[PDB]
Amino acid sequence: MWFEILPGIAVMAACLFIPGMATAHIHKFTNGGKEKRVAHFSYQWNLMERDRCISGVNRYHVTKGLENID
Amino acid sequence: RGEYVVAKLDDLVNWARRSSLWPMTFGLACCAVEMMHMAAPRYDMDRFGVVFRASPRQSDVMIVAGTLTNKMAPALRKVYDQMPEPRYVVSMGSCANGGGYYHYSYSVVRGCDRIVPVDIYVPGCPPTAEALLYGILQLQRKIKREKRLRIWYRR
Amino acid sequence: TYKFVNMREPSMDMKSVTDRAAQTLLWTELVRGLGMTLSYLFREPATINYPFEKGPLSPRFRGEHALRRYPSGEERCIACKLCEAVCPAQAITIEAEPRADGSRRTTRYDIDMTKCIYCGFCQEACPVDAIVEGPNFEFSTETHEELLYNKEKLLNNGDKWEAEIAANIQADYLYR
Amino acid sequence: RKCDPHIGLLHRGTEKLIEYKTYLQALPYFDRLDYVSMMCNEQAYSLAVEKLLNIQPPPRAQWIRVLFGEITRLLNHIMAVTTHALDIGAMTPFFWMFEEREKMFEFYERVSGARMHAAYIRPGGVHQDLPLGLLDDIYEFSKNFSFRIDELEEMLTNNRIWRNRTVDIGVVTAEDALNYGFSGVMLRGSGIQWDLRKTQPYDVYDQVEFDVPIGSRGDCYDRYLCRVEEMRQSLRIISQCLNKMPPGEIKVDDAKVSPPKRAEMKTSMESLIHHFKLYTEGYQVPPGATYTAIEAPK
Amino acid sequence: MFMINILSLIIPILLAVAFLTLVERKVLGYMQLRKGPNVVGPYGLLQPIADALKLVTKEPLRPGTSSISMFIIAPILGLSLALTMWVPLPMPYPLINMNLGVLFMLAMSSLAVYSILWSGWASNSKYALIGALRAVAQTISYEVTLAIILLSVLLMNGSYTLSTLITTQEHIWMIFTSWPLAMMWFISTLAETNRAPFDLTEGESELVSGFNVEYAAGPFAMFFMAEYANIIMMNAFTAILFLGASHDPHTPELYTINFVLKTLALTITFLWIRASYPRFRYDQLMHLLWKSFLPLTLALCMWHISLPIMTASIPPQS
Amino acid sequence: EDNKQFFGRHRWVIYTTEMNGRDTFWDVDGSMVPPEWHRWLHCMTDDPPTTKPPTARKYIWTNHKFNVSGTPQQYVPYSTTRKKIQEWVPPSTPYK
Amino acid sequence: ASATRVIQLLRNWASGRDLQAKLQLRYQEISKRTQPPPKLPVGPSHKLSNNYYCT
Amino acid sequence: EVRAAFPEATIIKPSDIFGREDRFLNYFASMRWFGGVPLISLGKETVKQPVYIVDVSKGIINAIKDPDAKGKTFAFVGPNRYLLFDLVQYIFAVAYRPFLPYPLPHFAYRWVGRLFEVSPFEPWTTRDKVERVHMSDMTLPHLPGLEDLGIQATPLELKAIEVLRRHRTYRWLTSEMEDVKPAKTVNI
Ligand SMILES: COC1=C(OC)C(=O)C(C/C=C(/C)CC/C=C(/C)CC/C=C(\C)CC/C=C(\C)CC/C=C(/C)CC/C=C(\C)CC/C=C(/C)CC/C=C(\C)CC/C=C(\C)CCC=C(C)C)=C(C)C1=O
Ligand code: SF4
Ligand code: SF4
Ligand code: SF4
């Protein structure tokens, strides 16, 4: 009766599930709900600094729309 | 009381040992072949926690199964000395329990105990693959009943 | 007669060559093994769980010895030393004496369970069915001394497994 | 480059101790000798003692000796091929047969009492007749077995990894193998068409038709097929033995050689006297020397 | 909270490595007409913990002839690489998103051999040196194609970043386009981890235990995780490399469930292969790869560079 | 017992919770099987003791015992014979 | 412990043969473990005359 | 007290006993772990006369067989007395580990012994143990020694590698006895 194999991989299935679950939610939590920004090039990194400077609270994941400008 | 926590840590340690003891790959003679039948799908020793690991550096119980002779007795005791602590030696079969059929010959040590501190004795010629299946489980009860830390907390 | 076993020359036709080339390139006999084990994965395991259920035996099984006694209660062994005379391992050691009643019993019947090899000759030996191995394959002990049985332990085994020995011998007394 | 095989780590003084035991008491020695071909071992010793005694076993005895001697060939060849793959690294084929060869050990115990060491095949015939229903149980297993022997062949015989690990490796030629004192598979594997069951048939092996697989390359691989083919050829022998089992006794009628049954033991003078001396002194065989060899599975 | 993420990527893996041992015992057993561990707790689910405590409370053998400092560095080096080489894996969102993920994949994979190397030397024995040097021979044939297959497959992905692998595999599986490479990658990933037909370095029947002969208790227990954490991670590498699942931008649950199932299916096949085939010979292994594998890699890599240009299907770099 | 079963699993025992004093919750063994049921359990017969009661006699035990190795009830070998050579007891009367 | 027909095909197909015709696990086809008492035969020399040992 | 309760009780008075599991040679051999080897006043004012384990073992056996052991009090001592500094010189030479002696005042060593006593497991060095290393084996010639029983004492020089072969690194593992010279013995 091969069902007994399943409990073994069942907890394992949850075991590998936690990391991907953790990283996605931790990124979602720390970075203001939005998905964590990716900076593979200097243009992205330069873009991130501008967001941080204009945020005022020194946090890139604080985006101010048209209400910021006049 | 410190006795309670010692007993709880006592039960934790031995339960790990009795449910994970690994019989060595140490076969000698007729008594070894049927012990394979214990590892065969019929009785499936592995289901009870044991694995048949070689390399006495990574084994707990030594299944001396077969005729123990003169020319190999140094090899066994060297092997037994290599096994880490704790280590148990189950003398398996009548040959290793005193000499078996060839008790009176000239190149057999009459009993595995004369070289090694021999644990629970399972008789048979050969003991059935089930006969020492109890022999392994009966050792698991011996591992269950030890005190160790209980003596240490009362030493 | 005899049969040749392996010299089968493979054909060199383009169909055969491509079949072998496909076999070597696209591993097939390796996949044949994988499909085999997977089929042999969804079977029913041949294991039996221990003591809750136990393996099957036969009435003539050979195990722990026992010294039975007559229906009256008198022991069967009249100390004829036949079992000692046939013991291949010389495990039997008995001495007799004229008992107080006048009957012919044995003072000592030490059977060394660490010497004898369960030939069963002893149960074939005595003409009164005195010594006989019981069905109890299980008597493993923690110390070497416990295995060296004397007359008293043999009688105790006779008194314990008497139900089995009477039934088993009843089944197989006709085959012998 | 050079391999010195130091042996002696299991030298029980068997041939020394036999000197001190009666012929009946020496029988379990051969049982323990080659502990994977038990019935074949006692068959060798029994034939020698019968030859010296100038006594033949009853027709029923010879048939079950052949029948049980052949499932013994099933046992050893199972052990040889499976542990081969085990030593090579293929663990799965080891376990599948060992469940099946566990079933054959049941037949061992049902007829003798012990799983391995039957001590059943004795000089002058077997100890006692088979239990009722034993032959039917043989038929059920023999039906299933050929459906597992091919299963082994599916696992290894055509496997490329097993082939390379075994093809054209450990190759021994014809003359050197013959000169080296080789026998059995070592001869049949290298092309020499020799088999004691055919050339010098003992017991009733002549009245049984079977083929002897002969290899051509003589290497490690060719012997693996030779052993596996010996499995199937043994199954044919078992099929004939079951179908041609004759009625009759199981030991030589001569009570001075084989012990009388327990029935006449307890009523007749001569039977008890013979049983007494046979189990105390044993049958005195005539002086002389002989060398009897049989086609043991090894 | 980045530290919380680090443990959330270490401890959940560690239990996954632990239960692979129990799963392998049961998978191997049920492929053997056996039952596998089922007495330690229910269904044998407590078995890894039973072995867990025994090993860490087992007598840790120090061999006298061993070089102690190198003796202890090897178990540390083996486990440290195993965990840190999980960090660039793009489980929905990778923990460590780097433009050169696969290069870092190869670097610590190549660093892994020095565990079995230094341990084999430090054990100071015949079987120790035999296992360690055949470990060289096994792994020496191994990086040359491992890089080539990685290069050829990724050449149409766009770059070495692991995150963009999902975008490339958005429409169809990578295995549909490079199945000749996938079989060859799979054998090598089965091979880099010293598993199933290629386990010469351990070689139970022929080297008793190889490098692990003089390694007991935790030093052994550490060696088991490095071997088994590399099994799961390499299969996870193959799962993203060739069977990249769909990724909803708003629900990372979807990819995580699909990705984990792919890793489980692949890891079972590792046990599937481990049960079935026999074990190669380290000369045949080298001959198998540098005489049959490597020639196919070069032409297949030749095909996979010519193909994007000829079809005007080169992938974006950014 | 279940006839529709792979041979070997068709008969099984659920061990007692108490036997001769010792607690036989989770720790159990194979020797706690009384003889009369040992035959039926090991497929030595197809007749349970309830259907066929074994023939009762005086000397048969009324309480089965497990293997008593380890516990202070374990069996110790000892010579069952009498003394062979005694000695000439010296007299009580003095020298003179 | 009978396999579900769904996997009966799986084991049959994956091995390319009909397992259910003949299985390794035994079942009710085995001979009964209790058999009637047998009557064994006598040997050829169980003759109460003309059975002299000299011949 | 025992002599009072059991007048005919043979009292054996062994000196420091050395052997495989002796905690005397191993004590100084294990001293290498904690930096150098600390000896109070370089241990130059403490003379020890150790005795091999087996001789005292045979002494007890011979005492049982001897019908004159009743009431007597034997003092089991070795053949030669060695100043403690030279003894440690001999031990570390046989083990080939470097010797780094350094003085240590008595009050500070007592403090060190106190710290080691804190361990709830087998202590490595107690304040009592520190005192024992300082206690030179008092010579009691009036006390019947070991040769009267019949056992000839085995000099520590012969059977010293037994205890200390284990402590040697792999480098000097196969080194024999004659490699290291016998240490100087302050004799009676
Ligand atoms: C000569 O004679 C012989 C015999 O008889 C004497 C025999 O019988 C047999 C027959 C018996 C057999 C079994 C046949 C096979 C046997 C052989 C010897 C043949 C050769 C073998 C092979 C080629 C294959 C060898 C395969 C092996 C060893 C399997 C390995 C894989 C496994 C999954 C099994 C082992 C699993 C283990 C040890 C369990 C997991 C390990 C752990 C360390 C436990 C987990 C630990 C932790 C998690 C660490 C602690 C951390 C925690 C808890 C985390 C939380 C805490 C924190 C602090 C973080 C043979 C063959 C024989 O030849
Ligand atoms: S006890 Fe019996 S079966 Fe075991 S090795 Fe000795 S003779 Fe062979
Ligand atoms: S069973 Fe055989 S070997 Fe054992 S005591 Fe009886 S006659 Fe001797
Ligand atoms: S047990 Fe049997 S053979 Fe032995 S003395 Fe008694 S009656 Fe004779």
Closest ligand 1 atom to Cα of B52: 13
Q: Is E114 exposed, middle or buried (0-12, 13-18, 19+ CB in 10 A)?
A: middle
How many inter-chain contacts (C to F, CB under 8 Å) are there? 125
* Helical ranges in chain E per DSSP H: 2-30, 47-56, 68-84, 101-111, 113-122, 126-140, 143-154, 164-168, 175-192, 204-207, 217-242, 252-276, 282-288, 294-310
Closest listed residue to residue E261, CA positions, set A10, A2, A4: A10
In the annotated binding site of H for NADPH, the residues are 16-17, 22-23
Question: With contacts defined as CB-CB under 8 Å, which chain E residues touch A36?
Answer: 93
Closest listed residue to residue D294, CA positions, set D37, D79, D119: D37
Nearest CA to ligand 2 atom 6: B95
User: Kind and range of the H or E element at B5?
Assistant: helix B2-18
Residues comprising chain A, all counted: 70
Resolution (Å) of this entry: 3.5
Query: Sign of torsion, CA C101 C105 C106 C112?
Result: negative
Question: Do F and H touch, counting CB pairs below 8 Å (3 needed)?
Answer: no
Closest ligand 2 atom to Cα of B126: 3
Q: What is the DSSP letter of B100?
A: G
Determine if residue C4 is labeled as part of a ligand binding site: no
Nearest CA to ligand 1 atom 5: B25
User: Kind and range of the H or E element at H131?
Assistant: helix H127-134
Q: How far apart are CA H71 and CA A41, in angstroms?
A: 96
B39 contacts B45 by C-beta, under 8 angstroms: yes
D54: left (phi over 0), alpha (psi -120 to 50) or beta: left
The CA R_g of chain D, rounded to the nearest whole Å, is: 21
* B118 part of contact set with chain F, CB < 8 Å: no
Q: Which amino acid is at B32?
A: A
Nearest CA in chain F to B139: F70
Contact across the interface for C147 and B97, Cβ inside 8 Å: yes
Q: What is the dihedral of CA H104, H109, H115, H121, to 10 degrees?
A: 110
Main-chain dihedrals φ then ψ at residue E65, nearest 5 degrees? -75, -10
User: Kind and range of the H or E element at C94?
Assistant: strand C92-98
Identify which of F6, F8, F43 has the shortest CB distance to residue G33.
Answer: F43
Site from E24, E58, E62 to mutate, B interface, most B CB atoms within 10 angstroms: E58
List all chains that touch chain B, counting a touch as 3 or more CB pairs closer than 8 Å: C, D, E, F
Residue whose tokens read 């990283």:
A23
* E45 part of contact set with chain B, CB < 8 Å: no
CA of E180 to the centre of ligand 4 (A): 77
* Helical ranges in chain C per DSSP H: 14-25, 29-39, 82-86, 121-125, 144-147, 151-160, 162-172
CA of E204 to the centre of ligand 2 (A): 26
Q: Which amino acid is at B122?
A: V
Instruction: Count other C-beta atoms under 10 Å from residue D59's C-beta.
Output: 15
Q: How far apart are CA H70 and CA H63, in angstroms?
A: 9
Query: Sign of torsion, CA E251 E254 E257 E261?
Result: negative
Q: Which amino acid is at E262?
A: K
Q: What is the three-class DSSP state of E26?
A: helix
Q: How far apart are CA H182 and CA F27, in angstroms?
A: 60
Q: How far apart are CA E114 and CA E118, in angstroms?
A: 6
Nearest CA in chain C to G24: C46
Return the ligand number nearest the Cα of B112: 2
CA of B53 to the centre of ligand 1 (A): 6
Residue A16 CA: distances (Å) to CA of A9, E91, E247 = 10, 9, 17
Q: How far apart are CA H83 and CA H183, in angstroms?
A: 10
Does B86 sit behind a cis peptide bond, omega within 30 degrees of 0 on the bond before it?
yes
Main-chain dihedrals φ then ψ at residue H160, nearest 5 degrees? -110, -30
Half-sphere exposure of D52 (CA within 13 A, CB side): 18
Contact across the interface for F67 and B138, Cβ inside 8 Å: yes
Q: What is the DSSP string of E163-230?
A: THHHHHTTSS-THHHHHHHHHHHHHHHHHHTT-TT--TTT-HHHHTTGGGGG--HHHHHHHHHHHHHH
Q: What is the three-class DSSP state of C4?
A: strand
Nearest CA in chain C to E183: C26
Which of C67, C126, C154 gets mutated to test ligand 4 (max ligand atoms within 8 A of its CB)? Answer: C126
Main-chain dihedrals φ then ψ at residue B64, nearest 5 degrees? -75, 100
Q: How far apart are CA E184 and CA E289, in angstroms?
A: 10
**D196 vs chain G: nearest CA distance in angstroms?**
30
D183 contacts D195 by C-beta, under 8 angstroms: no
Which of C60, C67, C94, C117 gets mutated to test ligand 3 (max ligand atoms within 8 A of its CB)? Answer: C117
User: Kind and range of the H or E element at D230?
Assistant: helix D220-243
**F6 vs chain G: nearest CA distance in angstroms?**
5
E50 contacts E19 by C-beta, under 8 angstroms: no
Tokens of C165: 């020995």
Q: What is the three-class DSSP state of B23?
A: strand
Nearest CA in chain A to C42: A2
Residue D259 CA: distances (Å) to CA of C104, D114, D181, D262, H78 = 25, 21, 38, 9, 71
Q: What is the DSSP string of D20-51?
A: GS-TTTTHHHHHHHSTTSHHHHHHHHHHHHHH
Closest listed residue to residue C124, CA positions, set H53, B101, D276: D276
Determine if residue B112 is labeled as part of a ligand binding site: no
Method of determination is: cryo-EM
Instruction: List, comma-separated, the residues after which chain C is broken, a break being a C to N distance over 2.5 A; otherwise answer none.
Output: none
Nearest CA in chain C to G18: C39
Question: With contacts defined as CB-CB under 8 Å, which chain E residues touch C53?
Answer: none
Q: What is the three-class DSSP state of B86?
A: coil
Question: With contacts defined as CB-CB under 8 Å, which chain E residues touch H169?
Answer: 64
- N- to C-terminal Cα separation, chain H: 32
How many inter-chain contacts (D to E, CB under 8 Å) are there? 48
Say if strands D125-126 and D121-122 run parallel, antiparallel, or are unpaired: antiparallel
A60 contacts E42 by C-beta, under 8 angstroms: no
Q: Note every long-range contact of D43-46, with CB atoms under 8 Å and residues 24 or more positions apart, other chains counting.
A: D43/D69, D43/D121, D43/D202, D43/D203, D43/D294, D44/D292, D44/D293, D44/D294, D44/D296, D45/D123, D46/D121, D46/D122, D46/D123, D46/D124
Q: How far apart are CA D164 and CA D169, in angstroms?
A: 8
Main-chain dihedrals φ then ψ at residue C71, nearest 5 degrees? -60, -30
List all chains that touch chain D, counting a touch as 3 or more CB pairs closer than 8 Å: B, C, E, G
CB of C69 within 6 A of ligand 4: the answer is no
Q: What is the DSSP letter of H41?
A: G
Query: Sign of torsion, CA C4 C7 C12 C13?
Result: positive
Q: How far apart are CA B56 and CA H128, in angstroms?
A: 40
Nearest CA to ligand 3 atom 8: C87
Contact across the interface for C47 and E35, Cβ inside 8 Å: yes
Residue E23 CB partners (closer than 8 Å, separation 6+): A5, A8, A9, A12, E268, E271
Nearest CA to ligand 4 atom 5: C79
Question: With contacts defined as CB-CB under 8 Å, which chain D residues touch G31?
Answer: 132-134, 136-137
Which of B30, B35, B36 gets mutated to test ligand 2 (max ligand atoms within 8 A of its CB)? Answer: B30
Question: Do D and E touch, counting CB pairs below 8 Å (3 needed)?
Answer: yes
List all chains that touch chain C, counting a touch as 3 or more CB pairs closer than 8 Å: A, B, D, E, F, G
